[PDB]
Amino acid sequence: LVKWANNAGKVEKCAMISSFLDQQAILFVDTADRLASLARDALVHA
């Protein structure tokens, strides 16, 4: 653990950044799946 301490600063930074990019990358897909329902559910509601 100590011998690895040289990378203690720039591993969590990329772990969150990668998830953030993954979040938006997948949130858009999860976002898109919602519209398919909205393209019919919302039309029904209107």
Partner: protein, 46 residues
């Protein structure tokens, strides 16, 4: 008479809206800014 086909056209475009977000998301132009073709990611030409 003609407005009956307008609603069909309006709904036809509504169906096409969800199809647009279903294509430009998992695909995309393989830019060389990050040489993504080298590794795990998939491939889809422009």
């Amino acid at each position: 008479d003609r407005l009956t086909q307008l609603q069909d056209a309006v709904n036809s475009l509504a169906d096409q809206f969800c199809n647009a977000i279903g294509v430009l998301q998992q695909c995309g132009p393989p830019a060389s800014f990050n040489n993504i073709q080298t590794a795990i990611n998939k491939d889809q030409p422009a």
